[PDB]
Symmetry: D2
Subunit: 272 residues, 4 copies
């Protein structure tokens, strides 16, 4: 954006890097610090933010943390677990704040992350969508209220390549509701309905899963009664959703250097 | 309505009879002929159409076909298979046209019906919803066109007491599409998606089934591609949908006395 | 239901009375106390709850408060402002708790109500839908969070007889959001979009209004960004929604005799 | 794809060119002929289809029609009216078949196009979405059937930059329906509903317009009655929809060299 908190975007020609750039650009109060990328990169040294279209930006993609360690405040990393660990150890060093959206660490990789937080302020999360995280919070408000009277159904659609049903956001949704009811998902979940199934059992949570086309991700929780239903739906149209989520966090980091946070923290979902 | 085709509504204090009354009333060109009902009825002799609210109508519920055989042209029957057969034999007799929406005949009961048609004009159908029947026709237009490129998914929701999944309209939908593609439903249907399921197989038809609350019936067929999807949804809010369907047919009957028709005939779905 | 709090339902053959009966019946912990109705009633003395179908219930519709003042604890009133005032003065008298859903009082009628509360515990509200009231609460959580980044749109559909656009629940929704943002609805509302309108102004709230058929009421608030949108939709299928809302309140009343409450109170929306 | 009809994609690094490439690639029976682009291009001579990701394709972007006039059969043009005319005159010359999706010609530019068709087979259309074109056809089937009984409402949502309300697809929808009813859109359209509006007038068509976020385009026509509604919705997720539409047409062209067609022709909407 150009503003009071400057940022460097790790995996610059990543599907993630491309979109974080636009967001960095876009969002008030952040400014594009640096735009690193792999050494073997073609996009190296040259650029700016022109995968985020956005023509000439004046910050040029790179390959050394040292080259630019001076050109940003918060390190946004959507990379591969390998890089993050390098990034990690560097940021701890120069006390650089990070925002890790990289996934797939083993226990050792997480621990490293928990550890750095000791010295470094870190937002580390598996879903940076702001809509998704709010929704999960809302679902749990709703359940406290209607949960016991209502039939609660969860319906998700994704593209034709998604490989496990239900999706994890969907389970996540099942679980917030379930937990709001002191109950247990595994106890009341029903993922299939085929043939004669008999009338719906009270208190169970049903899942319905649609797979088609190019659908990025659509999740609705229905709280149904006699005479009404309440529905809370999230639709993702692009990966941009994660992007603004991380950048927003990048901005939230400014001013902290305690340890370890997530989107509840950034979002304050917990006082909502 | 008061108009050029007069009607008698068999099971007068039926959930069906109540709503057909309002429709008879409502719909231009039909007029409420008679309003029969069971002998043991409380509503007998007394009434009018005042289950259809509608205050005073001047036609009084009854119990004899002879009592009123002169007071209507088309016999609308949503009753029990037993009554319909009595009704049947009477209407054949006086050449009364019928509209049977009664369900649950065995082979012998159907045959009787096929037989009467010889002398009597009959609309006999298992779903009198006009929306549903149009939809089925549209689905099949759509499939000719997009069917081969697209992922085709069927999603139905019903109340918490519905006992087999998918619903029959849903299978019906599966089958029109399937048949439009020269294909066979049983060959490409998928009714469940649980756990690891792998990427979606091309050409299969997936079903997703929601059961909650008081939902009368909601059915959507999704034809999804990369970059778009086309959806054709029907929602039933009340049993009125069947009602106007039969009354409409009652009117369509006027002027025929050939045999045996259904909603494709009434609706001309076949030249659509 | 038969249980620990007994109830009398004012306008017994009202569209409201019929449905409250079923709810009283239905809902755990309440029991049908009495079923009053107008003197000139046909349904008088005779009945039970058999407008709520529900065959024989053992409580017989009436016309005197004295006749039954002993047969119930909480007075549920969905009547006409005239009756409520009579009802009012009686309940104050015998310290009967009320639940007023009657609408259309002038200032004097409200004041009477405020006044009785002094001695009598009263739930008095203009919308007893539980879904609607929760939703309004959720909308305001959502706005605190996404309100500033997002385009917020409100879309309502009602039947073809609804006479002012937007509906009042919709304005209500506009206003909770607006107020969550410290903002003012009248300042940022846009109710029409026709012709050339130019790009959407930031921070405005747009309303889109659908009128067709028999739609009881459907209200969705969309919080849209780049890459996602979050939607919170309420659908009413019947007047039953209000019914369970009042009965639920009837139960909430048990144990109070302070003054004056509403659905936030009953629902505790305020600690949600 | 690699197959029996070879194609060249005019504006190669266009938002359109990028997506047509993937489609050309994707779709069975077409093969990427050539990938032209402007002279001043950076992408020149070099490439393949690697804006369509898709790594190495073996066909290299260019700048001369002569350079490659031998390397393709059908000319797909999503360019600027200026280029199309050059393209035009060349294709007429070598009897190259075209598919023009370029927009913004004046009368003279169209005429040129009408004229070339004399010698050249051309698909020329303002909306290449297959879903949209089918939908329009379906809407008109539906209206013949339900049009007179039903309340018909049109609801479209687009992103926050769309500048005229309703969208043109929406009017287009209004007009197919209107015309199916022998009626006239301008006579029965209602684009706004604000304040007291009174009950809905029969036979009118209402439009409701949502503007928010990044919504590519969502259009639903609702045919509502008492007791049901039928909805036909199209959702665009990307510009890919147009892309497959043109490529599909490119394939449909194979074997013609008569004049002038559109998507009804390609799609055979007219015998549907
Ligand atoms: N947390 C969330 O909200 C969320 C959302 C989306 C993606 N992700 C995660 O984001 C990460 C990025 O995914 P993507 O789809 O953007 O991937 P992808 O397009 O494959 O790009 C990888 C990026 O990282 C760079 N890279 C790979 N290894 C590197 C190394 O050792 N050092 C430096 N740069 C390296 C690449 O050159 C490129 O910039 C993944 O770990 C993915 O699972 C997380
Ligand atoms: N075809 C469709 O579109 C469709 C739709 C809805 C219901 N149905 C069928 O409609 C029929 C009516 O259902 P309903 O829910 O209206 O039932 P219900 O409310 O139980 O009412 C039965 C009605 O038939 C009368 N009745 C029963 N046996 C009779 C007899 O022997 N002679 C004369 N009257 C007799 C009753 O007194 C009452 O009027 C059923 O067979 C149902 O399966 C069909
Ligand atoms: N607060 C909400 O959530 C909400 C929702 C729906 C309806 N309402 C209100 O509920 C009330 C009832 O509407 P309804 O549609 O049920 O009306 P309606 O069907 O007209 O019935 C009126 C009922 O009150 C009885 N009645 C009329 N005047 C009376 C009197 O002086 N004393 C005793 N009984 C009397 C009638 O005989 C019948 O029981 C109305 O004031 C309406 O505006 C409120
Ligand atoms: N018919 C439809 O279904 C439909 C749909 C989308 C876009 N369009 C039309 O597609 C066309 C392309 O839009 P776009 O968004 O892809 O535009 P845009 O990204 O601006 O790209 C223009 C493309 O044409 C090339 N170009 C411009 N002038 C040229 C010339 O004189 N000779 C050769 N190449 C030339 C550019 O270098 C680039 O390849 C526009 O006319 C647009 O209105 C039509």
């Amino acid at each position: 954006h150009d503003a009071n908190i400057r940022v460097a975007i790790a995996g610059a020609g990543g599907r993630m890097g491309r979109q974080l750039i636009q967001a960095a650009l876009a969002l008030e109060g952040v400014q594009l610090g640096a735009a690193l990328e792999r050494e073997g990169s073609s996009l190296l040294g040259s650029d700016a933010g022109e995968l985020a279209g956005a023509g000439k930006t004046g910050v040029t993609v790179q390959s050394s943390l040292d080259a630019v360690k001076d050109d940003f405040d918060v390190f946004i990393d959507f990379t591969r677990p390998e890089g993050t660990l390098n990034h990690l150890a560097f940021c701890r060093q120069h006390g650089k704040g990070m925002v890790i959206g990289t996934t797939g660490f083993d226990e050792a990789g997480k621990q490293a992350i928990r550890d750095a937080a000791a010295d470094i302020a870190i937002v580390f999360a598996a879903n940076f969508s702001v809509g998704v995280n709010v929704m999960l919070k809302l679902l749990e408000k709703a359940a406290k209220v209607m949960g016991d009277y209502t039939d609660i159904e969860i319906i998700e659609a994704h593209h034709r390549h998604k490989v496990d049903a239900p999706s994890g956001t969907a389970l996540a949704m099942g679980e917030a509701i379930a937990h709001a009811l002191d109950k247990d998902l595994k106890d009341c979940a029903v993922y299939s309905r085929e043939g004669h199934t008999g009338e719906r059992v009270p208190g169970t949570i049903g899942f319905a899963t649609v797979r088609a086309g190019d659908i990025v991700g659509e999740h609705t929780a229905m709280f149904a009664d006699i005479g009404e239903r309440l529905e809370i739906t999230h639709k993702a149209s692009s990966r941009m959703t994660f992007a603004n989520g991380a950048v927003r966090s990048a901005l939230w980091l400014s001013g902290k250097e305690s340890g370890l946070f997530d989107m509840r923290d950034v979002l304050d979902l917990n006082n909502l």
